[PDB]
Symmetry: C3
Amino acid sequence: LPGDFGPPRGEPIHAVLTSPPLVPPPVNRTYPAKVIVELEVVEKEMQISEGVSYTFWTFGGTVPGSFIRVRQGDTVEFHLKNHPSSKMPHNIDLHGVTGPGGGAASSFTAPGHESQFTFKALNEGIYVYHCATAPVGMHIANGMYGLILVEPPEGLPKVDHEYYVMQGDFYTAGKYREKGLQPFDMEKAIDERPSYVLFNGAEGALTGDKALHAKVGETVRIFVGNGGPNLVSSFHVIGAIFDQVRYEGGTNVQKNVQTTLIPAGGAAVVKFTARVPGSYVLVDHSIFRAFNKGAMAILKIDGAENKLVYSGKELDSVELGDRAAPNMSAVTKATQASVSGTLTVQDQVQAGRALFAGTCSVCHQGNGAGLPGVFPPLAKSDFLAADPKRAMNIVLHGLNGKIKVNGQEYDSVMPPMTQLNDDEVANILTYVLNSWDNPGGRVSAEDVKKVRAQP
Amino acid sequence: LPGDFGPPRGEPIHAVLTSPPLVPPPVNRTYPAKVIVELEVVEKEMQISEGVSYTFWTFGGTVPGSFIRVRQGDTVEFHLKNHPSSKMPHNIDLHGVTGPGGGAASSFTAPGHESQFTFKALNEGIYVYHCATAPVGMHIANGMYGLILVEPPEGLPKVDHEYYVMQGDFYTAGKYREKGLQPFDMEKAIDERPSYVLFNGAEGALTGDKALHAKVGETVRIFVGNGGPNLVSSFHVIGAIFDQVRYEGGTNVQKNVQTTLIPAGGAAVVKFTARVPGSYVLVDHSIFRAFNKGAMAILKIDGAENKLVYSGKELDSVELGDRAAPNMSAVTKATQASVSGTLTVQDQVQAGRALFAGTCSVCHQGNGAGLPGVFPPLAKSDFLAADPKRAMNIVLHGLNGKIKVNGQEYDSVMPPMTQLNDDEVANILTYVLNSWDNPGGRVSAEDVKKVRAQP
Amino acid sequence: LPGDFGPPRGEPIHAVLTSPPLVPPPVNRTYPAKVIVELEVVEKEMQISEGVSYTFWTFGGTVPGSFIRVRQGDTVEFHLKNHPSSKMPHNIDLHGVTGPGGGAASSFTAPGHESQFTFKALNEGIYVYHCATAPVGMHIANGMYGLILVEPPEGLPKVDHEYYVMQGDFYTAGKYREKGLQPFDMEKAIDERPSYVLFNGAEGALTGDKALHAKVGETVRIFVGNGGPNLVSSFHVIGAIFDQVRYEGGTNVQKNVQTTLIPAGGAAVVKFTARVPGSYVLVDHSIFRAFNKGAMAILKIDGAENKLVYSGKELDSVELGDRAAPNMSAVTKATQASVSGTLTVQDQVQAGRALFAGTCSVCHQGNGAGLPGVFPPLAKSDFLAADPKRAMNIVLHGLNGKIKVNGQEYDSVMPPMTQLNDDEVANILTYVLNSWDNPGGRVSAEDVKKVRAQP
Ligand code: HEC
Ligand code: HEC
Ligand code: HEC
Ligand SMILES: [Cu+2]
Ligand SMILES: [Cu+2]
Ligand SMILES: [Cu+2]
Ligand SMILES: [Cu+2]
Ligand SMILES: [Cu+2]
Ligand SMILES: [Cu+2]
């Protein structure tokens, strides 16, 4: 057989698993071992977006699940526990396992139980693991996937950083950024029409203050999975190139590519060398996923600029939108205050401030000044103040034709923004009204609901 | 030119074509030949699913069409007949043909006619062939695709088994498993929203008693096509690895991968070595296709277990659902009896038995016992017997909150199952009522239609 | 660093950019240079289909944008101008640029402004460039993408022809071929449900009198991009094979393939050797894109037939439909005449003539003769003349069952063609009525609207 390094030697090893985006250290071992893996399924509510809860089903309490790292030829004794608070039964299929279901029929586990099975890791590579419990699509859609690395016997070449990034498509009853606890939507899942496409199980999981880091001159290896369930990732790094891309345990290694297709259920190891400082964006280049459904992660490189290689500036809200900023915690706070019935004007203003970035600032500027004759001002805007109800209709339904703002004529087009939720329009407009010497007061989600219902 | 082995020699050869999932024997020849291919288009109703008929358009009476096997450098004299019962005209485009339309403009054939054209097979490889008659998408969607192998002059390396598997997406007016003769749906086809995604033209075409077979230690080569028309396959083998994947006649060979993307209209040769016994599942790992639309095929390996490689069990209904069992012939029978107006309680019970597997058994068990305090029993269930109408609402619309069943409290969640058709809910519940000392009687499709219409 | 050929030498070079489908000449240079690129964003209405206008956003006035050609190790001084008639701000992200946003944060440009940034071209290859202005998906969907080639220092091998072909998916408020100025549809874009999938920004951009050309024996290199925003191309050449496919600046080169997957935002260089004359069709083999949404381009090879390689005929309307003919200018004319209120019977007849090809001729023949007993005649048809209103219902809703036409019984099936627009049915039927000794008169779009509204 391949990976035939004889029976386990040394002492049994209790595998150290890591939560995303971190990876366990290299096994750093010259002999095959008995590796004991203990993984516990937890079902739990987490925020899939600010003020949006979802009941995830997880391996080890995270999406993706805990990272497993073994050596080709190891004997893996796999213990799957299902937490007693679980409502569903669960199991595991590991890609790279030689045997039926990749472990599925020997890991079937009711709430409060444990199952175990043993496999030899014959196949070197990076592999997806996921739940394989009927209905399989529902279990995977809820977050039940992760990566197992089977190292080659000599180990992978040393790098400065190893990170763990996994794409998933998600199906909520509600629309993108519609607030509240969102049920799984089986109709959207069967139709392959996700409301969110994410890295590491949430909007902003790898942006702002949760960006991945490295320094100019350092090597980064990223273990990249695609849990699906349904989508194929046009996986891409903005502003850089992959030194290498290797799929699963394939003999083929592609070098010097920027855009690579990762199948649903697929995985790849990519290598990046940091050359110049700034934010390097990992996306699904099926662009509405990256820029309208959440599929953007950041590798932030710190170090000296090299003007001979790139003379230009770090990214801002023009490219990264409301994910340029460290976090949108103000949106979470305002959503919680709406639920409690304690929502203040200032709660709305700080939420609107976070949401205004990119969404409105690309044309009206971060300071609401616009560009005289080209983009009208929101700062001290006579037009805004004259009719707050018209302002709600402009965000929902757009505006075109000649207008006069602060003594100047505009003859341009503001596209409609009907995909903004009622709370988002209300918070953005309350921010604008309470900024730049505008008249203050507030716009409520309920105000916007009535305007949406009759344009 | 490539494949320049001079003029045909020896005797003209009448090509032996095979129906899926079988392949013609290796050409086993050292000289180029004149190969005469005779292929006849037949339009005909076949079962796309149990009790679901569809009018397929076929090359040779099967989906995919008859497998053609020639040698690089052969002169192929291609005869396309259109059966006189056909309503549409048809033609053929073979990938790997050097010339306009791959044969399309010289193979255009009205019902009851024959066309012929000659081509030299310059290009070694595995290639899709399909109909290229306006509207091309409708002809391909109805089943008009297959494979032609152009062998290299020295032939392919010998293996124990060669099989023929081809994925297709299908567009019915009705929903998945909605019974009756289903028309082609052009709106779903243009939208790329298939109701079925299949191997070899039907649900269960390669599962249960129609699984592919091999023995521990044997090599299997699978000629894998993707007829589309629209989908890209994340083609994957559960519990195993491909020794090799080679696309069309590409110089590139990928080795040691589990998950590979097959383009719409693409084809690949994969090689598998059987290591341990059990069912190895070929899927489109765009998981709702594999587990909700029919895209699952089985390679069943018989032979000695190796507990050093895999300690675990063969797959069952937890993973393969209602395709674990040899066949669902009882569903076909019950559908026929509904049409005839002769549907008996026992017809419903045997259909419901087949459908209960995985769909209900994953939580309630194959024997309806459930798991005390975790999954309530369907066996001798006081709760079921108290209100059969409530049971219909529970399958369609789900159940949550505290209930008491056979003296025990449950506080859990049964997801809704509204994608089940009225006949499916009726048959499953009639099976349950007539099992495990439950009260008997029956639930009709019409009973379920009324409950669906007002939750 | 890679591409470390020292500082720029010689004179600064003003890059010569080309409009699709042409490519600038090889740089033909042994030293690294300072290359000045000047690219101007223009927003403008163009015909996305005959009689269908769309407001495109373009780099250099075309979709795809102007082709840029530099050498690995060049210092590129990039000048982006935004035309003063623009309503939106714009920027550029070039794949293959080493630095944040690929130029995005240093190229942000309001209407009537200019931005500049400098980069070293470290990475050899073919690369997509696109707008990266919030909302990024809307800018790319409107046409803001093109290719930059970074040549290897020794240059690419010489070929007879170099062409520029770029796929895009497009989202109109109206359905496919619905006439008038079509707004961008954000709902369809987010759902990844394009109304058009095109090469070079229009239906027929590379068909008929706009086909690419070469001669038997000549080599063709095609720089193939996929601007997306959302779709992955099953990129395929009908009737031929690619000698080579190379993605971006990848070390991997695939040889001898017919079907290759291009990611959203991806690019590839393909090489084709012309062997036999005729039309070679470039498609997205996700077949409803190629044959129902516009994703078909033609490489027309002129030269001597070789009956030893391919005995068959050039393509016609059976395969290429209404794109076999040089152009459909008559449809543009009839649409303009409807807007003006000057629409004549002859305007309708010539538009219907263009649309009848393939759509109706595949079964009824180019001369309306049909095939006695199999396809009924439209030529001198007693059945057509007896009830023009029934003829409208037959095109929209199909026809089956026994009929008698010109003394012969037919018992067959004409599929419904409800995806035809009201003007298309009206023009086709007016063409038929004014041909082949039929009674004349006309059918109006308004006649068809009333029949569609009550079958
Ligand atoms: C460009 C792509 C824009 C984005 C994004 C946003 N707005 Fe805008 N807005 C824009 C233009 C060109 C115009 C004028 C339209 C015309 O007919 O010429 C506007 C107009 C407004 C107004 C009214 C005028 C004013 O007070 O200055 C308001 C209140 C306004 N826009 C608000 C607004 C908000 C809140 C945005 C994000 C949600 C937003 N705009 C985005 C161009 C663009
Ligand atoms: C788990 C994923 C389940 C599947 C699949 C099916 N059912 Fe279920 N069912 C489940 C639970 C947890 C519960 C209790 C809900 C609660 O509020 O605590 C139920 C309940 C029922 C009942 C009523 C109670 C009883 O008689 O035991 C019925 C009649 C029932 N379920 C039927 C049923 C059928 C027919 C299924 C397949 C179609 C099915 N269930 C699937 C959990 C799960
Ligand atoms: C085959 C795939 C067809 C295409 C494409 C079109 N038509 Fe057709 N048509 C076809 C058949 C088999 C029949 C007879 C149906 C039967 O019940 O046996 C028809 C019938 C008509 C008729 C009425 C009969 C006649 O006058 O000959 C008309 C007026 C007609 N079809 C028009 C028509 C037009 C305008 C088409 C393109 C828009 C078209 N047909 C396409 C088969 C096929
Ligand atoms: Cu699970
Ligand atoms: Cu899997
Ligand atoms: Cu056909
Ligand atoms: Cu094809
Ligand atoms: Cu732009
Ligand atoms: Cu990009």
